[PDB]
Amino acid sequence: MREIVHVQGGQCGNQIGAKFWEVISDEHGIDPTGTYCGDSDLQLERINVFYNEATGGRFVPRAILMDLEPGTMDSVRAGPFGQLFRPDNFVFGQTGAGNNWAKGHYTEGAELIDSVLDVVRKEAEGCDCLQGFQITHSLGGGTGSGMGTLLISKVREEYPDRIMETFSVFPSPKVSDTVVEPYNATLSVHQLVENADEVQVIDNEALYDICFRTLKLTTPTYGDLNHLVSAAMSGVTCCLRFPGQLNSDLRKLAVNLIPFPRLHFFLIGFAPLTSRGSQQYRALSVPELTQQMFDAKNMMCASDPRHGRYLTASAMFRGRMSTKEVDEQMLNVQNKNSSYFVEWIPNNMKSSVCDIPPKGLKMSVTFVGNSTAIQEMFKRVSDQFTAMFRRKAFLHWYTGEGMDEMEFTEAESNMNDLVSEYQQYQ
Amino acid sequence: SQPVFASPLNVEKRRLNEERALMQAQKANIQLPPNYGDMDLILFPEGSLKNSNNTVIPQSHLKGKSVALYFADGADPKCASLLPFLLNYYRTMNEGGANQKIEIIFVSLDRDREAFESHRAHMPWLSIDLENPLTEILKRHFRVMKEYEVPTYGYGSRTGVPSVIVIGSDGREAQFLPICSGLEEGDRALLRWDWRNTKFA
Amino acid sequence: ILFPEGSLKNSNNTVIPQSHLKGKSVALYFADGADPKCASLLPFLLNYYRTMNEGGANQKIEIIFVSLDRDREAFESHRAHMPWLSIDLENPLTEILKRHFRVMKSRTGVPSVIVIGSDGREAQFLPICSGLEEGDRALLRWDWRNTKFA
Amino acid sequence: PTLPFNAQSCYRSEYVAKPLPP
Amino acid sequence: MREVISIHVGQAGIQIGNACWELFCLEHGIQPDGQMPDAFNTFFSETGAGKHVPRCVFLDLEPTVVDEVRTGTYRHLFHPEQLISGKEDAANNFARGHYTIGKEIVDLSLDRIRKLADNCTGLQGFLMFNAVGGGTGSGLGCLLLERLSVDYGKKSKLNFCSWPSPQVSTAVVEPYNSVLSTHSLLEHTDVAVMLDNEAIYDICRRNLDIERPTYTNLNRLIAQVISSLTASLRFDGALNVDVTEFQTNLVPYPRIHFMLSSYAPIISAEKAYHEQLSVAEITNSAFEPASMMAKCDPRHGKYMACCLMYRGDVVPKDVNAAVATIKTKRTIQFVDWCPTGFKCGINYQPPTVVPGGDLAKVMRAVCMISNSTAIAEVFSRMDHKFDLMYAKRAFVHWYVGEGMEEGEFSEAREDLAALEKDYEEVGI
């Protein structure tokens, strides 16, 4: 049938993925040992989309774990749902790309691609016909931003008639992890725009804002924050697994969102986001789901959407809700928030009604949107690159490992060009 | 085998009726096992129903009236909301004629005897006592449950408490009143009742 | 049932059941012998009792007295003032009610007449020693017409 | 590990065994 | 459904509101837990099945009283984001609320109203609750009421004010705060029910025979008036009147919209036992100089418009005869150009009652609202109290230092002078 291969690259990807497989497993009701209980045909009829039977009732996920240091791959092994993964699925580097894109890509990474492609195609050809891939990486680090974008380029040329969606974490406005930040991001954007179909942006600090305000949690760990991405990254792919009235797919929303091939960078929002205190005092309906999903303090990218106009936007509703109440409201918001959208697209919005609500919750929506509000975000990465290039700071750590100074000049030109189209289309 | 197969009323029904079917077939062209159409059962036994005067009435008293079961809990807020409107509907609809029109049976999802009697003091229609097994048998028959406690056999919850089910002579679900259902007409779904074509024959 | 079969005694120290109270307004009187305030409130209460029973053809009001005295020697000595019912100091019921209605020798203290409804359900505090502080005059605001034991 | 999910599709709900015309 | 929205600004309106929504919960039979064990749609929404949520907004710049509402009785029936709390109180300064510190709450408030007002059409009006004398009630009350006038130009909005009394003022800057209030609370609002506090002080001591009350008795008594005002929006009756045709009946010209109130009966269990409150005499007590709630004798003014919601069992016999009696009275003088003056309203629902409060259950009530010229000196009294203090610049530098300008104080002078000039112009 239809298969989605999961690849997890880098430290951030491997952490974020281990929480994702927890959300999928209990959405389908699978014991962490791998066996089945939960008693429903409709949660089970589409299980080959992520899992493979192994003759003891069990499911091993079609996930491959990759990293250039074995530190965080034992983290997922020892931690929750570590028994589920396949030991052959792990691929180790013993050295570690120390936040260096150069050794992520050219020098150090090249001798490990010969192994990671082995397992991926071994899982690929086992089925009838593959549908797509999904990759979790952060564009800050080395073993995700460079070591990941090479695996993007290799599997794309092997199987050009399939798709891929990458959940990517970028830099931040104020606080700044990984002081060689703009080098790894810009070098990865100009590769990611050339070899990948869809990219969901995530920022730590719109994501820090949400848990401070909405969830009302004072000291937020990695576990609870990844649980908030994993629900969204489960929500976008509900429709492949569960039936509904107005069905969707990755390719269904791939063609419906992007007008032109070079701009495919998407924002994510999720709703409802309710603290413990306000949980019993809300009467969850389709109206305020739309009002929650169009909120500047709700999106997971630290861009205020009020600067730009939304170009194309999709809504994967989830549960049993009536459908004029669906469609009439997207009409409402498009007419009411006339300045928020773009005039040269009639019916800016897109809808989908996936028939099974998340577990325990009753009425959920997951908002994906191609905005032009990433004018300010990529011009942020741009001037950070210019600030650290004229002084030529930290260039030696890259140049000494087969890098070229010509690559950085192309990278800025090839990313200032991406800014050009966002501003052009107002 | 309507509306479900795996219900205690239907297992008792099947056992009794084909016991009788085999006996008379041997004693005599008769189709075994008997069709669900051909089967006959007594739904409410001798001492089940008891009215507003605390007097037991037989099943034959319910002939000619649209009867409906009402699964209620004393402490459930939704049931506390639905009760006044069901009472008012009973009031007006039965007052407005020189003929009895509808009748309500009370089936208790309540916790205990005290609370059951306290809640039953408010209702002017018939009821089945909570210690009577017929309450649990009717719950499993019509697949109403507040929580997955009793196993269901690949089915789901038909509804939640509160619910009104217009019934027939043989345990047929004549129609479901959408109080808390796929439609959610809280307090308003009672007007959907087609009392003319669902008489307890 | 608020009171078991033996917590109530009349003026002649003979037990009466729960059922006898019905038809008429009933109040609990939290008090003690030693207190100047109880000494000052007792006679006003006596006159109120007398007039509210005299003016008409029914019994309208009835008082059950709960003691916070030190022991028995004070208990009979302050019970012999009273032509109404009282709860024995040696029954547990006194400590349960004490703790329940929150008089303490903490929000409220002696004296405190509080009218009692159907089942628990105190109707009004009778602001004799409260924020209102209607000394010997709060007594009049009793609503016997509204509350009748049943 | 889950206790069982008991919401049901609209198609399964309502296109059921109707009593037949003869 | 047809509805009305409630706004409480400052320490005055907040605990009035505490007394307000206590009754409405008891009127509809909903417990403080929030659940009961279409008539209420005009004041309460629905949350799932069986849970009802108030449709009000609270607004105050300090959390010292806002927190007190949240941790009180209504922890679960209210909503946490329904209450808006700032950081620093305006502290008896018109300039602190209207100019500097208020701006950070208006953007938060505007968002709330817009989210509450958009969903259902057929809204009817708004209900302010504030003290004129208090700073936040005057300051942040104004800019919110100013902003609502610009946005929903179409829409009715009632005001309820606690005007400073001729003796008791409880603040030194009451004359400054009030005259500044009404310049910017003449134009923006529609109708403003004037109330004084020492008026109700003599109410509690004479009819309700309590020799010293406090705030929880004041707010309990204003809650009965507003519940008798707006029951017609909630429940049915033989003849009911809403918000939108109060202003039709009572406001002849756009400036003259400051009016009094009175409520009969105001009688304890002392005397509800002892006499009828018959229609022939509850209206007589309504016109009595005692029962009015705005501390000015109507003998030295001319009545011009009156509105009388009888609530409870009144047969129309008694109405007509009682009306005719009032015209015959020579002590009550109407203005000659206004032959009719009375807009009767009879409801059928009995009067409501707090439990364990000083209000006795009565089988009929009258809530009389009266546009009269007796307001003329109440405006000139505060004008005189302004004239003393303005004479040498006292307490000006607080207002000036915050961001106001000297000179807008002057603009309020001819504004209030025009208001006193109008009443003496109209009432001849």
XYZ file of C-alpha atoms in Angstrom, chain B residues 5-85:
81
model
C -27.016 -10.041 18.598
C -25.044 -10.289 21.821
C -27.477 -9.085 24.422
C -28.837 -11.034 27.441
C -32.505 -10.470 26.437
C -31.735 -11.879 23.001
C -29.805 -14.883 24.359
C -32.754 -15.701 26.683
C -35.146 -15.091 23.758
C -33.258 -17.408 21.424
C -32.872 -20.162 24.051
C -36.572 -20.162 25.050
C -38.006 -19.867 21.560
C -36.011 -22.542 19.858
C -36.483 -24.823 22.857
C -40.191 -24.482 22.115
C -39.578 -24.730 18.343
C -37.711 -28.046 18.593
C -40.276 -29.459 21.012
C -43.304 -28.734 18.810
C -41.387 -29.642 15.615
C -40.591 -33.091 17.021
C -44.147 -33.426 18.350
C -45.589 -32.716 14.891
C -42.120 -28.352 7.884
C -41.137 -25.837 10.575
C -37.906 -23.951 9.920
C -35.179 -24.480 12.532
C -33.667 -22.341 13.938
C -36.681 -19.967 14.073
C -36.607 -16.584 12.420
C -36.326 -13.523 14.654
C -39.690 -12.486 13.128
C -41.312 -15.756 14.245
C -39.911 -15.592 17.794
C -42.102 -14.268 20.679
C -40.918 -12.971 24.043
C -42.297 -11.321 27.137
C -40.208 -8.167 27.556
C -41.111 -6.927 31.038
C -41.818 -9.841 33.445
C -44.550 -10.064 36.042
C -43.116 -7.786 38.700
C -40.945 -5.334 36.769
C -42.924 -2.152 36.128
C -44.278 -0.058 38.986
C -45.996 3.310 38.611
C -46.555 6.606 40.446
C -48.877 4.889 42.982
C -46.182 2.246 43.726
C -48.426 -0.438 42.096
C -47.162 -3.139 39.706
C -48.885 -3.111 36.338
C -48.669 -5.909 33.747
C -47.204 -5.521 30.263
C -50.656 -5.611 28.634
C -51.357 -2.167 30.126
C -48.851 -0.578 27.699
C -50.853 -1.495 24.600
C -51.844 1.517 22.513
C -49.211 3.936 23.856
C -45.866 5.096 22.432
C -43.480 3.799 25.077
C -39.926 5.032 25.581
C -37.148 3.965 27.930
C -35.245 6.700 29.744
C -31.753 5.805 30.907
C -30.933 8.278 33.643
C -28.372 8.922 36.336
C -29.147 10.998 39.432
C -25.816 12.839 39.633
C -25.049 13.347 35.934
C -25.360 17.077 35.007
C -26.679 16.325 31.513
C -29.508 14.221 32.991
C -30.212 16.960 35.540
C -30.561 19.343 32.574
C -32.723 17.027 30.427
C -35.192 16.035 33.201
C -37.405 19.226 33.337
C -37.907 19.319 29.569
